[PDB]
C-alpha cells in the first residue's frame, strides 16, 4: 500500500526489527504525506515532525533534533553526504530522535531506486507565488525483467509569498539502474544531480534595545511583510551537487547477505548575500547597513561501506544482526570574496541622509528599502582557501536477540577513527595542522511485549561525552494500520555541560477507513548547567504537528494541518528569539480518472507572518506567506 501514512519498517537493513519493536523514537515521513502536503523541500516536509528546527548561510539547512545540532548526521540511504535538499528523488524520510550506532539524532533520506514494475509518473504544479514545478518519474524493466532503469527529472522555479524579489530556480536529473531483480546477486548504480541558482533572502533584523539581555530579549523588528534588505544586482546563491552510488549485494546463505556500497560525491557552493545591519544599531535611526556575507566552497567525498547482515541461533535464541566496515575521505576547500561595503561613516554606520547614493548604496531604509539600488563596490575572490583532507575508518556491530515472544534485547557498538590535515592559505606563511581522534559509542535496549501489538521499552546509549536514557511505549491498533507512540528521555552532555529532558507522542495511520492521521507532540526542557540556566538555542519547548486527510466522497479527499512551534532562542545567551506561532494548511484532491489526479494546497491559510529560523546574532529568517498550489499528476501503471 503506497498511500499509507504509517511505515512499519526502516528501509536500511542495519535495523534488525520492525519499528513497533525497535527500542528508539523513530518517525518515518512516508511518500504519501510528502505528496499530500505538496512539500517541495526537506524542510517543508519536516514541518510534519515536531521539534525539528533549522538554524545555522543564506538559507539555514542545518537541522536541530532534541535541541542538538545534526548537520553532519544527514544520510542518504544509510551513507553520509557531501546544502539545501530537495525531495523529488525521495521515497521517504526517516527521523531517528535519539542515537543509533548503526550510523543528538539523525535523518535518513531513502532514494527512489529502479525496481520491478513498469510506470511513468509525472506532474506539474502552478502557484500563487509563481511556482512552476515539473517532475517526471519513469521506471522500465529490461533484460526480460532481470533489470530496470529509472529516471527522475525536476525543473522548479518560484518566487516566495510575502518576500520581495526572493526567488529559487533549480533542476535535477537522477538516473538509476538495477540488475539481478529477484536473484541472489543484485547490482545497483545511481547518479544524482541537482543545480540551483537563487536570489537569497536577507531576513529581518532583530530589534536592538538598549537594555537587551536574557531578561529582556529582542525579537525581529516589525516592518512591512515583503521587506527585503538585499540587492538584486549583487546577491546570488549558486550550487551544484553530483553523487554516484554503486551497491553490490550477494546472499551467501539463506541467513547471510554481504553488501558493498561505494559513493563518490562532489558539491560546489558559490553564495553572496545580505544581512540587515549586523547589530550596529542603525535601525534605531531608521536605516540599515547592507552587510555582505559570502561563501565559496568545494567538497569531494569518497565512501566505501561493507556490511554483513542476517541471522544466527545461539542458546535457542534468534540473533538478527548487522556488522560492517566503513572507509571514507573528505576533501574540502573553503574560500570567499572580498567586498567593499564601506558606508562612508565609520565603515558600517548609517542614517537617513546616507541612504542611497551617498553611502554607495551600502545603507538603505528600514521601512522602505529598494532592492534594485545600483550598488557597485568591488567584488574579488580571496583565492586564499582553507583546504582540509579528512579520513575516517569505522567498525560497527548491531544485534537484536529474541529471548521469547515477550522479550527482546538490542545491543550496538561503534568505533570511529578520524585523521585530518588542514592547510590554511589565508595566513602567511600557510599553516599545515594535523589532528587525530576517535569516537567510541554503544547502546542497549530492552523490549517487553505484553501482547503482540504492544511494546514497552527502556534504552540506554553512551558516547565517549554524552548519555541518553529513554523509556517508551508503542501500540498498533485497527489491524496494525494505526501506530501510537509515547516516550520520555533524558540527554546529558559534558563539554557541550547540558541537559535535555523531554516527552514525545506520535500517531500515524488510519483512525477509521476514511480518516488518516500523521501527528506528534514534542516537549523539550533544555538547560545549560554566566549562561548557567539558559535554554538551548533552536529548541522549542513545545511543538505540535497534525496532518489529516478524510476520504469525504469517492474520488475526493480533503485535508489539513495545524502546526504549533513555541518561541525559539537564537543564542546560548538567550538575548534574541523568534516568537511562537500557529500555522494552518488545507488541501483537496480529486481523482479525474485512474491516470490523472488534481490537487489543491493552501499553505499558511491565515497568512501568518512568522520566523522559521532564529540565528545567533543580527537577524532571523521569515517564512513564506499564504501560498496556493494547483497540481495535475499523471500516473500510468
Author numbering: 27 to 82, 87 to 112, 115 to 135, 142 to 502, 531 to 562, 576 to 608, 625 to 732
Paper text:
In this Trojan horse approach, the transport of drug conjugates is redirected via TonB-dependent receptors (TBDR), which are involved in the uptake of essential nutrients, including iron. By in silico screening, we further identified a PiuA orthologue, termed PiuD, present in clinical isolates, including strain LESB58. PiuD has a similar crystal structure as PiuA and is involved in the transport of the siderophore-drug conjugates BAL30072, MC-1, and cefiderocol in strain LESB58. An in silico screen identified PiuD in LESB58 and other clinical isolates as a homologue of PiuA, sharing 60% amino acid identity.
